[PDB]
A paper describes a structure:
In this work, a BGL from the thermophilic and halophilic bacterium Halothermothrix orenii, HoBGLA, was characterized biochemically and structurally. It is an unspecific β-glucosidase with mixed activities for different substrates and prominent activity with various galactosidases such as lactose. The overall structure of the 451-residue large HoBGLA displays the typical (β/α)8 TIM-barrel fold adopted by retaining GH1 enzymes.
The 2.0 Å structure of the 2-deoxy-2-fluoroglucopyranosyl-HoBGLA intermediate was obtained by soaking crystals with only 2FGlc and not with an activated compound such as 2,4-dinitrophenyl 2-deoxy-2-fluoro-β-d-glucoside (DNP-2FGlc) or 2-deoxy-2-fluoro-β-d-glucosyl fluoride. Based on the elongated bond distance compared with that expected for a stable covalent intermediate (about 1.35 to 1.45 Å), the structure may reflect a somewhat destabilized covalent complex. It is also clear from the electron density that the equatorial O1 hydroxyl group for 2FGlc has been removed. The attachment of an electronegative fluorine atom close to the reacting carbon atom serves to destabilize the oxocarbenium ion-like transition state and reduces the reaction rates in both the glycosylation and deglycosylation steps of the retaining reaction.
Numbering used by the authors: 4 to 448
Write the structure that this text describes.
Amino acid sequence: IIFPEDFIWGAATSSYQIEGAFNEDGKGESIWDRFSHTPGKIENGDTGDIACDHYHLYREDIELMKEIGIRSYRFSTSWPRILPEGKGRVNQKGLDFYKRLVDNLLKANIRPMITLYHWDLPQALQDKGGWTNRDTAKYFAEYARLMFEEFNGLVDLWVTHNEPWVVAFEGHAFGNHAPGTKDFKTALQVAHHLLLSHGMAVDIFREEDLPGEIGITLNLTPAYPAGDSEKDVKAASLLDDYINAWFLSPVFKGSYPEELHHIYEQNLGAFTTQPGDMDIISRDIDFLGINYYSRMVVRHKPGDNLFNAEVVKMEDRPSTEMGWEIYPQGLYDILVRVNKEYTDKPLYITENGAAFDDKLTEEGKIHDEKRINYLGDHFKQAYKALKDGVPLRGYYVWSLMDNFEWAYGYSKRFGLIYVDYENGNRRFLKDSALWYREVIEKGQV
């Protein structure tokens, strides 16, 4: 298991999950500040108010990055830290933070990858409808241009959106994420606008002519039939379209998946689009980021939902603390499938990782063997994709450090680095960090 010497090994984080400084230096309120300050939304009543305090501690975190020896760092930039009202006047101190961060990364010889939108929409824009208001797509594109202007020649890897499926459905259909709406029609409308805003930002990226590459990051969950049944095969196919094709087909083919689009329209009425929208969404991009964690097993079950499809819990197979099945073969399957059916573009694993119950010892050690085993098994499947012709260029571990795990708060730890929040927010390299360091050095597992 040997990787190319120029293979981009990285680690990823997101702004709201690590930064803290939620109302400091002119930053505006985000929907996640609002959501986390609403009673009952987050486990244990945790908030992202302080989190890892990366906003103040970023210079120390870069030192740890160098220690591990990662070649690239994927992070997201907070829209309301930069534009408190989502539009209008720039908050120079918010922007100065990211300028300092980037200059530091480059001096450390770590390649930055910026995600423009990783879920922290300005609350000011939410009060005007958020992602159901087509104007939000335009403001996003103006924000994108601002960032392209400021980081021209400094950042050469760009992702417009992280996981539009999760933003749309978890945030607007099931209400588990900010803003917390529970309206499936709204979800579909939001998904369309996220896609539109993506294409709008790609157009601007070309126009600004800065060097580097732009893509989008999609969470992908391959679906597998629970039985030999042709009926299960079709049900599994449908849930697969629900998560994967719903976003992959517009971006790369310029259309939504037909059968699913029909099912939605007949049960819910049509969501609002304009002519030429599919052209914008499907602009040519430079790479696809894939976020992979697990798979779903599907049986046919008429009634009980719109797709007539039920997800089977695999209780007999290993799982992480999130309750997600461990299934490394899925990572291979999705890379191959993407390269076969959707695109010949370079692919990056922009997130993959696992939560396990981590224990900090007295000498400041964390023996997270299960995380090492999870990561090793997934690296091996990425190698196998690479060997078989997939143009995989890089792999980012989620996450560089323990952080605010959305609705679960701080109770779920995904980091290579343990964060001892209440003791000066001190950082400790887990054994998985030490293992990853050896992997990157030698390019082999």
